Amino acid sequence: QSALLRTGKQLFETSCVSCHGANLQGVPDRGPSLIGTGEAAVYFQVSTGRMPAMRGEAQAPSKPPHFDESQIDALGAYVQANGGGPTVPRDDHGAVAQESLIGGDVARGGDLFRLNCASCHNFTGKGGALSSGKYAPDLGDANPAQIYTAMLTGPQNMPKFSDRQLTPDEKRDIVAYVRESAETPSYGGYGLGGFGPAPEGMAMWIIGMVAAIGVAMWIGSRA
Amino acid sequence: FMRTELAMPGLQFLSNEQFNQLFTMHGTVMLLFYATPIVFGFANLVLPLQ
Amino acid sequence: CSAGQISQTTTQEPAVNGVNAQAGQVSLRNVHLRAPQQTDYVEPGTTVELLFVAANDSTESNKLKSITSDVGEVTLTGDSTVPADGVLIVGEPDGQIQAVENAEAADAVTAEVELTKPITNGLLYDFTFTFEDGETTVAVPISAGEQPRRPVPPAGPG
Amino acid sequence: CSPPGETASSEPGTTPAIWTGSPSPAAPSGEDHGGGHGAGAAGAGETLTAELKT
Ligand SMILES: CC(C)=CCC/C(C)=C/CC/C(C)=C/CC/C(C)=C/CC/C(C)=C\CC/C(C)=C/CC/C(C)=C/CC/C(C)=C/CC/C(C)=C/CC1=C(C)C(=O)c2ccccc2C1=O
Ligand SMILES: CCCCCCCCCCCCCCCC(=O)O[C@H](COC(=O)CCCCCCC[C@@H](C)CCCCCCCCC)COP(=O)(O)O[C@H]1[C@H](O)[C@H](O)[C@H](O)[C@@H](O)[C@@H]1O
């Protein structure tokens, strides 16, 4: 929309021309060109809050969003018009769809996640370390739209899963699996994170061994 | 490090953020981690004697 | 020093199908070919459109966009001198919003190519974009914006 | 030690030729039938279409 495009243009002008040069052409060695990234990429990066980025590091981290939903959409529309690319899913009302992106099937979502997502993230969407200062962020925080748009657009050092690699049905399934694993309570007691061997070993050596050795001292006698 | 970078108009070996971290941590180290502790170092050293 | 002069984030190409060519005063971004292929190749004689955004780096201008032709007989319908510190958007990349129903200068300089040669998506094809300031080879890819998977025939076990 | 194979900068390569698999040999000779019928001729099977051109 004309007013939407104007607002997105002005926010882009006063927020990121310093590294995605005016006219959306990326500044050499500061930031990539946004022509073609699409409305999905802006929603994902600016909603996660990574995109008004303030350093070149191994990886730009997620941080509190510096924009809200309406002007997030304004930036996304501006970028989409300039370049042309993927669009964020939306519901009948017109806002970013959240519940509609929870695919009904979760076992299929589980297989897709483990084959594709767990490679770097985790069994259950926890984090994972990458080559040099990089990592896969935890998926507990991301909302269904953010998960969908993260699969749709590889943000950085993430494979870009086009709508053909993962049909919107498959992306909804993976979103459902991610949400189910994130919000599902850990059976069997306090889940020591999601990583098994390391949290469990640390918990043993702290809780169980401190308890056992303290009981040994109590029953035993120093001498 | 900051001074070697600053001897030249260009960025010889320090990226902008590397230099910024440099002056940040230098100021913090030299105020809060060398001086404010060494005042109390001299205190512990001599004040009980004095 | 993962945030040194060699940082991963700064040296990151956009995660888009199109290719970016910085040679010359004008910079090319999101260069690709829209060419829906129904078979192994795109047969010669079928028009496939060429998408790209040309940005004039300097405000002092290289708005000519002379020929930008290669093997394929590139044709620039509705040619115009758009670049003045601004985007020259030749076509409508999938997801591009038409801001208004009316179109200024008719089509916004839409570029089409008659292949005269088989092409299949997943290959690199050279397109010599010629500007008055200079000329540049891009090795343009083939991009499919949002067309979902075409139903593959179900397999019959044997 | 380094593996013997190593790099090849020369001979940039050629675009792979379109694959044309050979018919399955006598071992996997089993394949979809083309149609059965009396076929009292040189052979036409149980499937024969036609296109009407103006
Ligand atoms: C080990 C030893 C005394 C050797 C004697 C000399 C000898 C025979 C040398 C030749 C053998 C060789 C080649 C040794 C080199 C490498 C080596 C030791 C290989 C064998 C490894 C092995 C089978 C056993 C060694 C294990 C060992 C004795 C550990 C120390 C045990 C003790 C008394 C620990 C302190 C008591 C205590 C309160 C422990 C709990 C507190 C904490 C948190 C301790 C630190 C800690 C530990 C100790 C974990 O194991 C651990 C595992 C997974 C996650 C986290 C942790 C962790 O945080
Ligand atoms: C000693 C025996 C007592 C054991 C405790 C028993 C308590 C039972 C707790 C209640 C029933 C089970 C809860 C299961 C649900 C549950 O697991 O509890 C989480 C919390 O988890 C956390 O954050 C940690 C919170 C901090 C408190 C617990 C810390 C205890 C540690 C220290 C004990 C081990 C000792 C290790 C020693 C360490 C170093 C010493 C040298 C809470 O939810 P949440 O927070 O949202 O989890 C996120 C998903 O949502 C989200 O997707 C997901 O992506 C994640 O972000 C996930 O965290």
Ligand code: HEC
């Ligand atoms: C290592 C290869 C890789 C694989 C494969 C991969 N991811 Fe990621 N993922 C990453 C990296 C790296 C990031 C961080 C992106 C950033 O920081 O901009 C990320 C970010 C995300 C996020 C954003 C979460 C947040 O809080 O910002 C989600 C959600 C996500 N991935 C889900 C998935 C899903 C679903 C799949 C399966 C389609 C998948 N990932 C496969 C590496 C990968």
Ligand code: HEC
């Ligand atoms: C250098 C500081 C910096 C600024 C400020 C910045 N960006 Fe970027 N941008 C980057 C970097 C670096 C990347 C790729 C790596 C990353 O995202 O961390 C990127 C990538 C992107 C992407 C995704 C590219 C893809 O292929 O997925 C989008 C969308 C984007 N930027 C838009 C924006 C918007 C909108 C703003 C203003 C809200 C902005 N940028 C501000 C540096 C910046």
Ligand SMILES: CCCCCCCCCCCCCCCC(=O)OC[C@H](C)OC(=O)CCCCCCCC[C@@H](C)CCCCCCCC
């Ligand atoms: C051999 C052992 C004895 C050492 C002898 C003298 C050892 C003398 C060591 C000279 C070290 C010179 C520095 C050169 C750094 C550099 O320009 O390289 C670029 C590199 C790419 O930049 C980086 O990536 C990060 C480098 C940052 C180093 C942080 C170290 C902080 C340590 C803290 C974590 C505290 C640990 C506790 C340590 C406590 C130590 C107490 C003494």
Ligand SMILES: *C(=O)CCCCCCCCCCCCCCC
């Ligand atoms: C990127 O990973 C880090 C960038 C920091 C570069 C500047 C480092 C300044 C020197 C720090 C001194 C550390 C302690 C030295 C012990 C002898």
